[PDB]
Design a protein around this ligand. Sequence first.
Ligand SMILES: CCCCC[C@H](O)/C=C/[C@H]1[C@H](O)CC(=O)[C@@H]1C/C=C\CCCC(=O)O
Lengths: 35, 207, 310, 258
Amino acid sequence: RIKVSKAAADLMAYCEAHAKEDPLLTPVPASENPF
Amino acid sequence: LSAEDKAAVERSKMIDRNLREDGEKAAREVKLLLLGAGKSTIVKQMTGIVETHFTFKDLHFKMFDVGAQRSERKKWIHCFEGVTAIIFCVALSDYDLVMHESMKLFDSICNNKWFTDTSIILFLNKKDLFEEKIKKSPLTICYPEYAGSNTYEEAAAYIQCQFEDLNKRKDTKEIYTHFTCTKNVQFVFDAVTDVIIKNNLKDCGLF
Amino acid sequence: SQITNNIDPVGRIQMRTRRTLRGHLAKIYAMHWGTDSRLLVSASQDGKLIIWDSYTTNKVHAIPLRSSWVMTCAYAPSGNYVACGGLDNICSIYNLKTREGNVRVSRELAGHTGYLSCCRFLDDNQIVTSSGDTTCALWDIETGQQTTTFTGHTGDVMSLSLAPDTRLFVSGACDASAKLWDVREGMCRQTFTGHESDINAICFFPNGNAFATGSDDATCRLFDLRADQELMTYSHDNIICGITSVSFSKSGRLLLAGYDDFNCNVWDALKADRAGVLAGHDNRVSCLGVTDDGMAVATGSWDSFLKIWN
Amino acid sequence: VAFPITMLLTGFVGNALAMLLVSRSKSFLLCIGWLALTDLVGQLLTTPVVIVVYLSKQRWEHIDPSGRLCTFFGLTMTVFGLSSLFIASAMAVERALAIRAPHWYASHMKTRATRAVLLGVWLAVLAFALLPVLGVGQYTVQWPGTWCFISTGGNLFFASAFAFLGLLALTVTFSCNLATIKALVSRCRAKAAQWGRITTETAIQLMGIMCVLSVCWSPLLIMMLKMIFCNFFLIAVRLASLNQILDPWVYLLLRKIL
Ligand SMILES: CCCCC[C@H](O)/C=C/[C@H]1[C@H](O)CC(=O)[C@@H]1C/C=C\CCCC(=O)O
């Protein structure tokens, strides 16, 4: 078993490394948003 | 907006015409469950689930004799909410054959939260074996205070009023008890034409 | 959960029903987005499995079933195959890109005893099903026989979720025990028990090394496959009903849970807060899927309406 | 002077409610909504002219030369007024069909005929109101000098046909409730009982309909046949509009109310 703080760090590192490419927390303008 | 889009929308409208035609054809059919604990005799004289389709006097309705699954009642019983009746079936020639389990099942079904509007038909199957077994031996053993007599008709009426008593806190559903004597499918015919009238008088809005 | 309070939370989320897909008559238990991010399927008790286009909101196919009791559906990663299963104890497979115009059934997988809860494709050659007789499986379409059967629990399996690399899945069951399986060998590897009642839906965190469990006692939890224990429970004190479906977002920051008090929610999957409610559904919601591109959700419900958000 | 003021605000507060209540929530809610909407519109398009006409105190012939405004007000009353009987009758025939042929009602009347015969009642009603527009009959100003109906004199054919066609509705209604009631009682008599409570609730609510349509549209229809063959006629339209006030209340309110 790995330390749960290390797994917490890994999940928050994956959380912060894809905040730019998320169309449902920082929405794109309606020029490209296909609906 | 080329010809492709217009062809696609005309295909969509043909699909919706067929879909609505099949839907309307579906709703003039009386879906009916067949819950139980002698179901085979009943479905004869009238894996997974089996649907039996039969027509009476210009009114064909299906009948869903579930019971081969035996997995859990809590997880797939809510797909049965829209249904007209429940042909429950209990043979009453098993009062002392090692009936309390059947009463527990009826208590769990009749009080269920998805079935507060479904009129539970009930059938009591084996009566000849019951009258022979009551002529030979008494039924004062299921309860120590069960019957105050030992004739056929008092015992039968006591059992019938014992099953109809478990209907807890409902004045919206109506148990239609019978005894399984042409005139065995006549009864579900004359007791499904009494729940669709109750439903029409709620449809046009009258009570 | 203790470490993230130095991270700025998401403020609030506003989502609007950008379409509404109309045409079902009975209730709804399913949907599955393609990898196209374009076409969805939906399965109902009319006996109809309808493939919808999510841009023009009109039908492409209206597949007629035989057993009108479906509880799950699947849409292949090759865009060719749909699957359906339910109380018939049979997983039917239909093919779309055929020589003729009409649609037809390819293979009738007929080897279970309980009903069907899920089914998810792997290739156009491997489908993994989960059932109500406490056993998953793994099938083979042409052969017709199951090449691996997982019998690891007592509770009936209710959900299923393949990994991003499609090498090992996860299944939670009616005995609150969520197992992590392995497709190659064919036996369980860990079992997590943290829930007080049974389990209605599970999906992986999109990385592939965590998963989220939605139970029937108004709580969700987030388990990890390397620390092997609960990290958060998400619960609000004003909930009675039970979760019915669960899905994630592409960045792993929103956890959308399909509750049973008539409306979905959005859970901050790192701070355990409540972001914003997908309100307005009339009856219970049954299913919701985020696209692979991550541009929408499409919640279905017993109201006969399949609505597409944002 | 206070009668149009009372019948305006009382009818408005009666029929606002039902529109709100009905809107939020079958083949009955639309056919009470289209009764409510027509009933309110017939109260909003007719009362302003009178309320205005007698603030002033002058003869209707002075304000309207050439006889157009009476022709407007002699067609509205017939049109909005008769419909209402033809909204009450349709509902009644449908309530009979339910109990008398229990299954025919399910297959054949799924909201695609509750926008058909109901939005055809207005057409049937109207290929008759526009006959003074084509030269037969005449809407003239009556004794008060604020409203208009059929002249007493080929006009009789318009005057007698109004009585005949206003009798159809009343008759149909009474027949349908008695037919329904008789069937319900006989169907409840041979049992051997919660179907009994259905009989009490319906009996009460299918006799209020049968009494309102004979306290209100009784005098206006019975005197017109004698007129074809002073003050009385004046009350004949206050009674026959009071049904409109109460139409919104009886069908979907007082039962909820009490
Ligand atoms: C066949 C009759 C149909 C009429 C229906 C119409 O919607 C009735 C509304 C009334 C209201 O009750 C009083 C009023 O002024 C409205 C118009 C009718 C009365 C005109 C004469 C009123 C007066 O001079 O007293």
